[PDB]
Amino acid sequence: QRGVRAVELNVAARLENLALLRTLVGAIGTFEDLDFDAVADLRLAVDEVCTRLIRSALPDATLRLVVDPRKDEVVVEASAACDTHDVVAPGSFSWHVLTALADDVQTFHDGRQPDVAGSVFGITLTARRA
Amino acid sequence: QRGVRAVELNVAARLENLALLRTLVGAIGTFEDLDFDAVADLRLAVDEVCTRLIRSALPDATLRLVVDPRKDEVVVEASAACDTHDVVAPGSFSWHVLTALADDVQTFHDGRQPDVAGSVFGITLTARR
Amino acid sequence: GSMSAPDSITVTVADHNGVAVLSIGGEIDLITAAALEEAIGEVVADNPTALVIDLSAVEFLGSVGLKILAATSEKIGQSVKFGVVARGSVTRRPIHLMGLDKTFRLFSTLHDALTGVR
Amino acid sequence: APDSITVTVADHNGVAVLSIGGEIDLITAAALEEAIGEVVADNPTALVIDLSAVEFLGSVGLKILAATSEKIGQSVKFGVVARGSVTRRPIHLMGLDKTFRLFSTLHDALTGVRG
Numbered sequence: 001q002r003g004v005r006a007v008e009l010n011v012a013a014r015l016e017n018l019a020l021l022r023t024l025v026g027a028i029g030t031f032e033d034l035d036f037d038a039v040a041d042l043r044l045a046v047d048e049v050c051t052r053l054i055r056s057a058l059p060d061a062t063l064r065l066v067v068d069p070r071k072d073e074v075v076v077e078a079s080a081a082c083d084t085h086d087v088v089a090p091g092s093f094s095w096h097v098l099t100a101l102a103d104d105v106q107t108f109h110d111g112r113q114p115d116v117a118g119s120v121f122g123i124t125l126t127a128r129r130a
Numbered sequence: 131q132r133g134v135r136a137v138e139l140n141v142a143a144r145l146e147n148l149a150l151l152r153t154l155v156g157a158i159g160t161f162e163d164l165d166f167d168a169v170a171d172l173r174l175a176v177d178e179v180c181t182r183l184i185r186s187a188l189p190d191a192t193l194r195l196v197v198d199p200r201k202d203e204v205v206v207e208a209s210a211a212c213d214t215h216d217v218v219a220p221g222s223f224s225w226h227v228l229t230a231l232a233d234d235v236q237t238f239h240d241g242r243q244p245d246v247a248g249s250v251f252g253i254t255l256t257a258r259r
Numbered sequence: 260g261s262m263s264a265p266d267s268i269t270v271t272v273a274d275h276n277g278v279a280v281l282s283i284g285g286e287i288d289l290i291t292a293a294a295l296e297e298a299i300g301e302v303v304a305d306n307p308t309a310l311v312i313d314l315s316a317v318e319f320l321g322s323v324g325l326k327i328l329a330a331t332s333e334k335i336g337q338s339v340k341f342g343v344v345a346r347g348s349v350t351r352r353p354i355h356l357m358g359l360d361k362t363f364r365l366f367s368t369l370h371d372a373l374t375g376v377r
Numbered sequence: 378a379p380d381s382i383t384v385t386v387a388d389h390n391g392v393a394v395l396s397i398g399g400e401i402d403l404i405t406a407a408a409l410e411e412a413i414g415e416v417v418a419d420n421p422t423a424l425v426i427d428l429s430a431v432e433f434l435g436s437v438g439l440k441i442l443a444a445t446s447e448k449i450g451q452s453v454k455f456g457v458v459a460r461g462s463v464t465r466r467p468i469h470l471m472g473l474d475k476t477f478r479l480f481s482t483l484h485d486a487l488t489g490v491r492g
Contacts, residue, residue, distance in 0.1 A: 007150060010138040017135065018288060019260060020161055022319060024137070027157040031150055040348035048322050051289050097322045100356045135262060145403055149381060152400075152433060161260040170462035171470075178436055181403060201263070227436045230470040 006068040013057035013080040021050050021065065025076075028067050032074055034127065042074070042127050045101040048094055049078045049123040056082040058118040072129050073103075079122035083114050087121045103128055135162070136198035143187030143210045152177050155197060162199040168259040172197075172204060175231040179208045179253045182224055186212035188248040204257045206232075211248035215239050218253065232257050267291055269316070270298045275373055278340075279307040284316035287324035296327050303331075309340035309376040313369050314350045325357055332363040340376040344369050378408035383430070386416060389487050392454075393421035398430030401438035409438070413445055423454035425486045428464040439471055446477035456490040458483050 009024060011017045025046045029039040046065070053063055061081040068075040088094050088107050098105040102125035112119040137158055141147040155176045159169035176195065183193055191211040198205040218224050218237065228235045232255035242249045260266050268291045269284035279302050287295055302310060312328070314320065332341055342364045345351035351367075354360050366372035378384055382405035383398035393416050401409055416424060426442070428434065446455055459465040460481045468474050480486035 004142045004144060005147060005150070006141070007147075007154070008138075008140040009154075010140075011136070012134050014134065015290060016262065016265075018290060019266060019286060020135065020137070020158070022286070022288070023157050023161045023260075024154055027153050028150070031153050036348040037352060040352060043319065044321065044353055047288065047319070051321070051323075055289070093322060093326065096357065097325075097353075101353070148402060149400065149404070163261045163264065166462040167466055170466060173433065174435070174467055177402070177433070181435070199261070223436065223440065226471065227439075227467075231467075 002066065002068050003070060006066060009065040009067070010062050011065075013054050013061040013063035015054055017063070018047070018050060018054060021063070022047050025065075025067075029074070029127075032069050034074070034129070038127060038129075041101045042076070045098055045105075045125055045127075046076055046078065048097050048101075049088070049125070052088050052094055053078055053080040053082065053121065053123070056080075056084050056087045056121070058083060061118065074127040074129070075124065076127070077122060077124045079120055081118035082109075082121040083118060085109050085114060085119060085121065088123065098123075098125065102126060132196070133198050133200050136196060139195040139197070140192050141195075143184045143191040143193035145181075145184055147193070148177060148180055148184070151180055151195065158197050158199065159204070162204070164204070164259050168257065171231045172206075172257050175228060175255060175257055176206055176208070178224055178227050178231075179206070179218075179255070182218040183208055183210040183212065183251065183253070186210075186214050186217045186251065188213060191248065202258065204259065205254070206257060207252060207254045209250055209252035212239075212251040213244050213248060215244065215249060215251065217251045228253075228255060231255075268294050270294065272298070272302055275311075275369075278309045278311055278373055278376055279305070280311045280313055280369065282313040282316065284318075286319035286321075287317060288319060288321040289323050292321075292323040292327060295324060299327070299331050303335055303339075307339055309342070310335065311342045311344060311366075311369065311372045311376060313344040313372070315344055315346070315369065317350050320350050320353060325353060325359060328354070329359055329362050336363065342366055342372040342376045344372050378412075379405050381405055382408055384408060384412040386412070391421070392423040392425060392487060392490060393419070394425050394427055394483070394487075396427040396430065398432070400433035400435070401431060401441075402433065402435040403437055406437045406441065409441055413441070417449055417453070421453055423456075423490050424449070425456045425458060425480075425483065425490055427458040427483050427486070429458055429460070429483065431464050434464045434467060439467065439473060442468070443473055443476050450477070454490050456480055456486045458486050
């Protein structure tokens with residue numbers, strides 16, 4: 001699980017925060033000494049997951065972003081209460097983007113029926129340090 | 131109360147996490163179009179409050195920091211489970227720093243007895259651009 | 260980037276000796292995608308012989324921008340010389356990683372693109 | 378020293394110039410104090426601490442600069458280069474611009490720390 005240098009960020013799950021998240025992700029990737037390609041890869045991959053989450057998020061949902069810098073890789077987990085389990089449908093362009101830019105990308109959700117009180121949907125991905 | 135652009139940052143309350151927090155706080159201020167003086171003030175103010183909380187924090191307390199950029203002001207709140215109620219107060223150099231940088235420096239705690247299971251101590255300030 | 264004064268993209272169109280060059284600055288994301296697609300549609304509507312989209316000043320290129328570039332290539336490419344200026348980690352790299360540099364012509368600089376669409 | 382701070386030592390016709398870059402915080406404070414201590418141990422007639430390259434000046438750094446001035450100011454001509462929002466600004470906000478001489482540039486400090 002999360003090391004001592006992990007950071008959890010929480011912002012309202014909305015389109016107005018989409019660019020804010022990107023700026024924070026880029027700051028973390030630079031702070032983690034990722035090279036220029038890796039910082040851009042991380043920004044794009046996390047922007048993709050945050051866009052998908054937000055665009056299905058419940059009206060008053062929080063987007064949670066956990067960045068866990070480990071020895072050889074940086075692991076990111078993004079999640080939000082969403083109105084569907086098909087936040088990132090298999091076969092979509094999003095899946096192609098995510099697997100091109102990150103490693104071990106996986107979606108998951110809490111199995112609750114989304115229409116009742118939403119269902120927390122999460123995406124994890126790994127940026128290799130080298 | 132929080133505005134739509136509020137950012138909650140949670141890290142282990144350890145001195146080794148201060149450099150990251152300063153970088154994120156600066157990125158928020160820059161993104162919010164604060165000018166150079168205001169970004170530097172925000173970074174220093176938040177660095178000071180986070181430093182004070184960490185030096186009193188329980189061994190694996192979480193430091194919770196909220197940066198809430200508003201319309202006219204940026205509101206900052208930071209809290210952590212601490213081993214004392216005397217984390218920061220008027221008369222210290224720390225307090226002088228905070229009030230030179232911010233407009234409405236306030237503290238609070240939960241009244242629990244710190245040596246039992248710690249006591250959450252909070253600092254709030256308003257940095258106006 | 261404040262809520263008061265949100266960031267948008269910058270759009271400029273110039274003719275370079277017959278070639279329409281659309282240049283974008285800033286971040287292309289789900290919010291600004293409509294602005295980008297409107298800008299392309301306006302240039303296309305003026306019926307160019309050749310179109311270069313210059314992403315030199317683009318600070319972020321989201322997946323939606325990738326989609327719009329490939330869709331543009333599909334919707335003009337037969338009737339119009341099409342080229343994209345992209346360099347570095349933000350722009351040409353994701354285009355390359357997604358295989359879209361096989362879909363439309365990439366160039367490192369505007370100077371290269373201009374000779375290339377001719 | 379930690380990687381997050383850089384400290385270099387130079388001479389300008391007998392004026393010791395201690396240049397700091399990176400961040401001055403609780404992690405790097407010891408390295409800064411040790412570097413000042415070393416310079417002062419060699420008995421300079423004048424010392425300029427150049428903060429031109431400093432990306433963050435924490436309150437501990439303000440304390441170090443004030444303490445240095447109090448410690449050596451009587452015996453060593455002392456000056457600090459600081460400009461802009463990171464360094465000069467909080468020194469003035471805390472009133473510490475009165476406690477040691479600030480200069481906007483190294484050129485000013487070098488031409489000014491003697492006479």
